[PDB]
Amino acid sequence: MSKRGRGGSAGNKFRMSLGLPVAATVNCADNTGAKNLYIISVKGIKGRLNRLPSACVGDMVMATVKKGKPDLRKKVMPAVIVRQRKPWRRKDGVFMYFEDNAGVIVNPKGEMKGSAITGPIGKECADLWPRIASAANAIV
């Protein structure tokens, strides 16, 4: 069976087009002290021949700190993608996009590793990760 484990979510509820591949650099939406991440992997995608793993809004990610906390430059840490510039399509049928591509850095428990957010979170991520949600100042 699965070597463990947890994380890979529940039904998001909406449709997202992938915007951040491997090696993409991304805003850190917390005050952990990290202030630019680099994405290396997604908890649960499987790819193929010649093609990049890409991640999106609601993915649980591992990312490494290109700028940021002392615990952080050049640590490799878990993260969640909170915002993206490439459109998401809701059940109603509206398309949402954000100004920035942003994630928060996360505990193996799925809580934030920082005291407070910066910027909005999509409610879809907040549903999925409710201990990211209960740090979020604004929910869209």
Binding site: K13, F14, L49, N50, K91, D92, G93, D127
Partner: protein, 389 residues
């Protein structure tokens, strides 16, 4: 290995092959839903022509997940589905060589419809009074011949089928005047009752409203849009080959291995693409109606609002829908102005899928693109116009 290495699913299906011209322009079912319901009032299929696509808002249903109850959009194909003439009852025998038709009983009236049936169908374009179709016997001499045929048919237990055609001058967007002939099986209860109901159904037309209920799960069958001839990338979904430049660009490398010194059938190679037969299953039939004169349409504030099923200005390269109509969920095979045939869902469990219907909120109607919504908008445009609107 041998190689390599880093290995892939193979592009473009083998159950969807040969990727080749279809033999006739109008789709053809090789099998039907089972006799498990009412007699041959249940014709097992109906036809229409694809007008375009529109869109709907509905009050939904589910409850398990986060978004729920409540308004949603879902996407819609509009088909014009005018009433179709069931002309004759065709008697199929079970034989150990397959089914064989025996004799056919005909209504008193197909009569521009058989002249259209003689147009590719047969040939030479219907000008001063020709091709010829045979006339009916002396009435009740020919009805006793036919009722002696009914006797053999309704003693030896025929698997009942219907010849029907589309009376096409009830569509407008194919400006064309020609009938399209089809074989539709008739399914139902016991075989004698099934012949009787098929008899009472050829001596008068059948609309969509007598074969499909609104919400019902329908398998839709058509022939794809044609491309012409193509290479492998746009015909089987293979990669472009990358370097800046290359003495072959959109190419397969080898079309085999050294052995087999003979190119296999399964390799992705160029050829024709499109104009392929397809059956596309389990389509939820969101509305059937008429422009009016059946409904009404939708309701004033609220449920939801009145919208004639055209986008104004017409469906691009089709026309205006203004007759009998069928709104089918999502995609439906073909271009625009092609024969599409609709059949009750084959997968008897019988189940979910759909079950419950799903209040029509919006059709779309549009009115959008720089202007809209209808009525008050058209008034507002006319105020700014004003001699050319």
């Amino acid at each position: 290995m041998s190689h390599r290495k880093f290995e892939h699913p193979r592009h473009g299906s083998l159950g969807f092959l040969p990727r080749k011209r279809c033999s006739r322009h109008r789709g053809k079912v090789k099998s039907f839903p089972k006799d498990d319901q009412q007699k041959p009032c249940h014709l097992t299929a109906f036809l229409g022509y694809k007008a375009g696509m529109t869109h709907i808002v509905r009050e939904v249903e589910k409850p398990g997940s986060k978004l729920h109850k409540k308004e949603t959009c879902e996407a819609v194909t509009i088909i014009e589905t005018p009433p179709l003439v069931i002309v004759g009852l065709v008697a199929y025998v079970k034989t150990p060589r397959g089914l064989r038709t025996l004799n056919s009983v005909w209504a008193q009236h197909l009569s521009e419809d058989v002249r259209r049936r003689f147009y590719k169908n047969w040939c030479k374009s219907k000008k001063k009074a020709f091709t010829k179709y045979a006339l009916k016997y002396d009435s009740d001499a020919g009805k006793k011949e036919i009722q002696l045929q009914l006797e053999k048919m309704k003693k030896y237990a025929t698997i009942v089928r219907v010849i029907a055609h589309t009376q096409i001058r009830k569509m407008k967007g194919l400006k064309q005047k020609k009938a399209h002939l089809m074989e539709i099986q008739v399914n139902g209860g016991t075989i004698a009752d099934k012949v009787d109901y098929g008899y009472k159904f050829f001596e008068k037309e059948v609309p969509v409203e007598a074969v499909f209920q609104k919400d019902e799960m329908v398998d839709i069958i058509g022939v794809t849009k044609g491309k012409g001839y193509e290479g492998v990338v746009t015909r089987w979904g293979v990669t472009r080959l990358p370097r800046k430049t290359h003495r072959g660009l959109r190419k397969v490398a080898c079309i085999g291995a050294w052995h087999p010194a003979r190119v296999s059938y399964t390799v992705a190679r160029a050829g024709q693409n499109g104009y392929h037969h397809r059956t596309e299953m389990n389509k939820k039939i969101y509305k059937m109606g008429k422009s009016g004169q059946e409904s009404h349409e939708a309701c004033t504030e609220f449920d939801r609002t009145e919208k004639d099923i055209t986008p104004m200005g017409g469906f691009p390269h089709y026309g205006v829908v203004k007759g009998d109509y069928l709104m089918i969920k999502g995609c439906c095979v073909g271009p625009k102005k092609r024969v599409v045939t609709l059949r009750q869902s084959l997968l008897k469990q019988t189940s979910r899928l759909a079950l419950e219907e799903i209040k029509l909120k919006f059709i779309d109607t549009s009115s959008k693109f720089g202007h809209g919504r209808f009525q008050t908008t058209d008034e507002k445009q006319k105020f700014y116009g004003r001699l050319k609107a």
